[PDB]
Amino acid sequence: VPLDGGRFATSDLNDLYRRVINRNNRLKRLLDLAAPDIIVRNEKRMLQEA
Amino acid sequence: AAAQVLSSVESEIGRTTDPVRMYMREMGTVELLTREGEIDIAKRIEDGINQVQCSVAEYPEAITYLLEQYDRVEAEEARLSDLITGFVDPNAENSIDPELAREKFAELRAQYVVTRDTIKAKGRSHATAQEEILKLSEVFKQFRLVPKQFDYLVNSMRVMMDRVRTQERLIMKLCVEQCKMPKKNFITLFTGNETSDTWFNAAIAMNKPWSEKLHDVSEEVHRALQKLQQIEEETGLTIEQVKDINRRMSIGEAKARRAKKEMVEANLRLVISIAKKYTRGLQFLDLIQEGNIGLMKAVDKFEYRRGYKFSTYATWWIRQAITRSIADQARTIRIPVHMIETINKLNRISRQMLQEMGREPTPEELAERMLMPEDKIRKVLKIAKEPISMETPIGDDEDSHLGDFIEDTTLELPLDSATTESLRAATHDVLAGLTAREAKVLRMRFGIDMNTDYTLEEVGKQFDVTRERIRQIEAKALRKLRPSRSEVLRSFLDD
Amino acid sequence: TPEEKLLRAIFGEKASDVKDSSLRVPNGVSGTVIDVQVFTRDGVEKDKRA
Amino acid sequence: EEFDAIKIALASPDMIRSWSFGEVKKPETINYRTFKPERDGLFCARIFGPVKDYECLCGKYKRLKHRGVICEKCGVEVTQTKVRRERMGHIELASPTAHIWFLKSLSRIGLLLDMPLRDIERVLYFESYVVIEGGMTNLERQQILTEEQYLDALEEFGDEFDAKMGAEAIQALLKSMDLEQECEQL
């Protein structure tokens, strides 16, 4: 929602949904370039944290 | 031997739960290759690249694919679009000139018709003819194709192999999973005869009682061979030459994927030394992973003939992939990269005004150093905010958040709700006292008790086709309602 | 609304592009104005009381 | 309006798609110049609903005369803005990730596999393998292999054993066990 003086005020869940999506779209970019299996393991271990 | 030291750790760990420790542990095994291993690998990468060119030059129609798509575009009397970028593009080991588009194509059309006849004479595999086929491999070899159109030609090997591998397993499903044909005696006939239907009844010629009862699928099983024999009609290549490509091309894709896996995994510490200059917009491991995508791009573009070390070139790509992620991600309301570049330009110049003046620069006087007017400087300063939070504790104890004070300024007020159902009932009383055809058009023209809004023509379409007097019927009713009945409706004026 | 489209079309009072949000005295307070301070952004023209 | 009871269970992946109204594909919230919700984002109007009562994003249809239309220029249903409180979307994960509630809350996933919780987490963190199905009588199901020991049984066996890592292994161990045979064993 927008506040009075031109700012916005958000929930904390929007920040938690953005790093789920960003670390999920980037996993679909590593399965296309055929990344080595240390980069793909760390990305699946980063999506589990998000 | 740097992996047995992890098994001395892994069964005896202090149960780490930090993912940066687990990532920095795994990259610690692979050692740093120094000044020769970059050249030892860049020879292994290119030797896996030209083996893909060696398996393209064995395809007869891949020569014409660069020929026939060029025949589309000279019939338009002028063509310099994005297609002409992706074509032949010969290297001197770029705007193209039309005096060379017929010069370098003089020998490519010449070799196009000469090699057809030496294979037309004395068979497919004549000795002095296959050397010309090996020479026809070299007329393409001095060209460097743009790798967007080149990927369409690698699909001319993989899909044309998997189309037969679909056609192979389709016979293995429809008939072999029913009739149980043995795969020991069957693989000899695929390289034995492979042209006629004489292989078929020869299994019926020997007794083998499971094969006599193929009468009920006698119009079905070799009908699936009519598509495997369809590819022989359209491609026009013998089956011992088709397997000589996708096996030999399977070595060039596993030699280049293995050598790129070594150049990537050895230089993982170069990414982790740049990525910690950019941590606190995004995350600590989000910057590492986005630079590793930039490192895999730098391996593709690197050339060892230039005479520079690999870390001089790869640093430009990791710094490009990391800074592009801070501009795309790391913000809730996404700002494009041209405005982030202007916002960062204001924050490096306002520090310079804090150096000389010793005060904060006014937007009237900050506009001189940027070469921008006062309205755009003040408008770039409108975007300066970030969303705060709704769970920020604006009370000094842990009872109140900011979200408990933000009002729902959306719905309705119950005085404003009850003054509407009072107004909906006043109109049902006033219009009931008027003449029924003035009261009908007054409900249709203003949409009272309906869901639409008519026109003078639409109401004129129904009752009578007068135009100005429908407007005069409406204007008459306002005089019929203009100050004894208007005492209740004048109270609704004060909204 | 459908009904309020008729009330404007009977007496004729149009609503312009102007909406009241004036600062009023908070209710329950009866005071006496002793000071007025007016701040103005640079470039913006001052009124006759500023 | 009228109900009698409140039932709670687990959500199937087909059920979570059944509550949904569209897939979120982008982390964008709104546009910074004109504060309107962008497509395919966390606030998208084609998925979750219109922002104003009976109005699409562009403005082609309005004011309740068009109630049951979907504006083909933008894709926003012309309905009330009360359905932004009730409509859900979904995200298709590119890798299956474990639920923290049925893993850490004391364990509901190592109680069903009879695996220790301190050993499941070595598989989830991509540290050590686990045997999904050992066809040769050398290895057993749910046997944990380090990355230096998995290479030895890779050469000795080839195809004869199934061993994975991550939550794609634990999804296979939960999919493989017969729940009826273990009540007929215990």
Curated annotation (Swiss-Prot), chain A:
Biotech use: Co-administration of salinamide and rifampicin or salinamide and myxopyronin suppresses the emergence of resistance to both antibiotics.
Known function: DNA-dependent RNA polymerase (RNAP) catalyzes the transcription of DNA into RNA using the four ribonucleoside triphosphates as substrates.
Free-text description of this protein's post-translational modifications in UniProt: Acetylated on several lysine residues in the presence of glucose.
Superkingdom of the organism of origin: Bacteria
Family as reported in the entry's similarity comment: Belongs to the RNA polymerase beta' chain family.
Subunit annotation: The RNAP catalytic core consists of 2 alpha, 1 beta, 1 beta' and 1 omega subunit. When a sigma factor is associated with the core the holoenzyme is formed, which can initiate transcription. The rRNA transcription and antitermination complex (rrnTAC) consists of RNAP, NusA, NusB, NusE (rpsJ), NusG, SubB, ribosomal protein S4, DNA and precursor rRNA; S4 is more flexible than other subunits.
Name recorded for this polypeptide: DNA-directed RNA polymerase subunit beta'
Swiss-Prot record, chain B:
Gene Ontology CC annotations of this record: cytosol; cytosolic DNA-directed RNA polymerase complex; sigma factor antagonist complex
One GO BP annotation of this record: negative regulation of DNA-templated transcription
Domain of life of the source: Bacteria
Outcome recorded upon mutating residue 436 to D: Disrupts the interaction with Escherichia phage lambda antitermination protein Q
PROSITE patterns: SIGMA70_1, SIGMA70_2
Motif Interaction with polymerase core subunit RpoC per UniProt: ranges: 286-289
Keywords assigned: Cytoplasm, DNA-binding, Sigma factor, Transcription, Transcription regulation
Compartments it resides in: Cytoplasm
Region (Sigma-70 factor domain-3): 341-417
Annotated region described as Interaction with anti-sigma factors, given as residue ranges: 467-482
InterPro entries: RNA_pol_sigma-70_dom, RNA_pol_sigma70, RNA_pol_sigma70_r1_2, RNA_pol_sigma70_r2, RNA_pol_sigma70_r3, RNA_pol_sigma70_r4, RNA_pol_sigma_70_non-ess, RNA_pol_sigma_70_r1_1
GO molecular function, one term: sigma factor activity
Site feature location: Interaction with anti-sigma factors: 445
Regions recorded as binding DNA: 456-475
Location of the region described as Sigma-70 factor domain-2 in the Swiss-Prot/TrEMBL record: 263-332
Function according to Swiss-Prot or TrEMBL: Sigma factors are initiation factors that promote the attachment of RNA polymerase to specific initiation sites and are then released. This sigma factor is the primary sigma factor during exponential growth. Preferentially transcribes genes associated with fast growth, such as ribosomal operons, other protein-synthesis related genes, rRNA- and tRNA-encoding genes and prfB.
Domain comment (free text): Contains 4 domains, connected by flexible linkers. In the active conformation, the domains are in an extended conformation, each making extensive interactions with the RNA polymerase catalytic core. In the autoinhibited state, sigma-70 factor domain-1 packs closely together with sigma-70 factor domains-2 and -4, contrary to the extended conformation that is seen when the protein is part of the RNA polymerase holoenzyme.
Family: Belongs to the sigma-70 factor family. RpoD/SigA subfamily.
Protein name: RNA polymerase sigma factor RpoD
Organism, scientific name: Escherichia coli (strain K12)
From Swiss-Prot, chain C:
PTM remark: Acetylated on several lysine residues in the presence of glucose.
Record function comment: DNA-dependent RNA polymerase (RNAP) catalyzes the transcription of DNA into RNA using the four ribonucleoside triphosphates as substrates. Resistance to the antibiotics salinamide A, salinamide B, rifampicin, streptolydigin, CBR703, myxopyronin, and lipiarmycin can result from mutations in this protein.
Subunit structure: The RNAP catalytic core consists of 2 alpha, 1 beta, 1 beta' and 1 omega subunit. When a sigma factor is associated with the core the holoenzyme is formed, which can initiate transcription. The rRNA transcription and antitermination complex (rrnTAC) consists of RNAP, NusA, NusB, NusE (rpsJ), NusG, SubB, ribosomal protein S4, DNA and precursor rRNA; S4 is more flexible than other subunits. In pull-down experiments interacts with CedA.
Family statement: Belongs to the RNA polymerase beta chain family.
Biotech relevance: Co-administration of salinamide and rifampicin or salinamide and myxopyronin suppresses the emergence of resistance to both antibiotics.
Disulphide bonds in the chain: none
Range of the intact protein held here: 896 to 945 of 1342
Name the record gives this protein: DNA-directed RNA polymerase subunit beta
Lineage: Bacteria, Pseudomonadati, Pseudomonadota, Gammaproteobacteria, Enterobacterales
